[PDB]
Design a protein around this ligand. Structure first.
Ligand SMILES: [Cl-]
Ligand SMILES: [Cl-]
Ligand SMILES: [Cl-]
Ligand SMILES: [Cl-]
Ligand SMILES: [Cl-]
Ligand SMILES: [Cl-]
Lengths: 216, 212
C-alpha cells in the first residue's frame, strides 16, 4: 500500500514529475484507485486519470482528515552540514514526530542547504512513515529561543534522563566540528545541555524526548 | 588510531590473518606502535615486530585496564533472522553496552547463524567502537527464563521496571507465534522503522541502567 503526495484543488489531486516517476515504478495505470496526502493532514482516495512523463492527476472520491496541528510543538534545530548527516537528521525528525525543523549554520560549518531539497527529503520520508501532516522547515538566523530548550552536545553526553521536559521543547542538535565558545556560552546560559556514534545519539536523544512528549 | 584484536602471551600479542590483512590495508609496517585489546577489558600498547601474510606479532610495551566485568548484567536475546537485521542488532548490542547476546531462532524464522560469524561482527564492531571487554555470544535453545526478563515487540517501556540484572527479548520479524506469546507471558514481563526502534529501545534501557 503506497502513499503518494500531491496538491488537492477543484476535486483533483495533481502530482509533479517526481511522483509520476514513482507511480510508473509501481507500474500504475489510468483507472487505478490510489491514496495521496497533501502533507497538511489530509488523505485523498482517488482514481488515476492521467499519468504522463512529467505530471499526473487523479479524481478525488473520498477525503479524510488524518492528523490535526498539535497544540504543543516539538522543534529541532538541525545543523547545516555534510549532506549525509543533514539528510539523516531530517529523516529522523519526520520519523520521530518532530513538528518543526530549523536549519542553522553553526560557526564552524561552511555548508549550505537547499530548502527545496530538504522538503523532498521530508516528503519522501513522510510518504514512507505514512505521516499526513509533514513537519515545516525554516531557516534560523540566531540561537535565540523561547521556552524549554535542550542542547545535544555531540562531543559530550550529559544527563538526558534528568532533564526537565515540561511544555513545548526545542532540541538543538550540535554541529559536527563542535560548538564554538561563543555558541557554547550562548547555549549554556539559555538551554539545558546533554560518547556515542552520531546517528545513535541523535535517535536516542530526540526519540526519548518524542516518547516522553508522546509525539510517538 | 586503530585498535586491533589479538591474543596476549608471554610479553607479545599475536594476531590472525583478519588482523594482519587489516594492518596492511591501513599501511602499518614492522616497527610501528600499535594498540591491541584482548577482548577481556585490557589495552596493550605494542611495537609491531612481525607482519606476515597469515599472522602478526607485536611486543607489549604497556598494558592498561580499560573495562571490568559489571556487577549487574544486561543480556539481550537476538532473533536469528535475515542477516541484515541480525548484524545490526549484534552491532547495537556491542555499542550500547549489552554484556551478553543469546541467539534464538523463533518459530517463524527459518534462518541459521554460525557463532564464528557472529563473533567476527562483535570483533569488528568492538574494534571500531573501542570496546575492550567484548560481549559473549551463545545460543539460547528455549525461551525459558528467570530474573527480570522483559519482552519487546519493536512505548511505556518508560514505565518498565529495569532494576537488577535484566534480559531483553527482541521479537522476530514475523511476530511471536501463539505458543511463543503464551510461553513468554508465563515467565517474562511484556512491555517506527526497525533500526530506529531497536536503538531507541535498547538504548533507553542501557541508558537507564547506566551501561552507556
Ligand atoms: Cl556534503
Ligand atoms: Cl543542499
Ligand atoms: Cl534555499
Ligand atoms: Cl555541522
Ligand atoms: Cl526474525
Ligand atoms: Cl572473532
Amino acid at each position: 500500500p503506497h502513499l503518494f503526495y500531491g496538491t488537492a484543488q477543484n476535486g483533483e489531486v495533481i502530482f509533479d514529475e517526481r511522483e509520476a516517476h514513482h507511480m510508473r515504478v509501481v507500474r500504475l495505470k489510468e483507472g487505478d484507485v490510489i491514496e495521496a496526502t497533501d502533507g497538511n493532514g489530509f488523505s485523498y482516495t482517488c482514481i488515476l486519470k492521467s499519468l504522463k512523463k512529467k505530471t499526473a492527476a487523479a479524481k478525488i472520491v473520498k477525503v479524510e482528515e488524518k492528523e490535526k496541528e498539535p497544540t504543543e510543538k516539538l522543534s529541532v534545530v538541525v545543523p547545516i552540514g555534510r549532506w549525509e548527516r543533514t539528510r539523516f537528521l531530517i529523516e529522523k525528525c519526520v520519523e520521530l514526530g518532530v513538528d518543526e525543523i530549523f536549519f542553522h549554520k553553526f560557526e564552524r560549518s561552511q555548508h549550505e542547504i537547499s530548502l527545496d531539497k530538504a522538503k523532498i527529503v521530508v516528503r519522501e520520508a513522510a510518504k514512507q512513515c505514512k505521516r499526513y501532516l509533514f513537519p515545516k522547515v525554516s531557516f534560523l538566523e540566531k540561537l535565540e529561543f523561547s521556552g524549554n530548550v535542550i542542547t545535544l552536545d555531540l562531543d559530550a553526553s550529559q544527563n538526558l534522563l534528568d532533564a526537565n521536559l515540561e511544555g513545548s521543547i526545542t532540541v538543538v542538535v550540535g554541529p559536527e566540528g563542535g560548538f564554538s565558545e561563543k555558541e557554547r556560552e550562548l547555549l549554556r546560559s539559555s538551554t539545558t545541555i546533554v560518547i556515542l556514534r552520531f546517528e545513535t545519539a541523535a535517535i536516542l536523544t530526540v526519540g526519548y524526548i518524542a516518547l516522553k512528549k508522546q509525539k510517538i
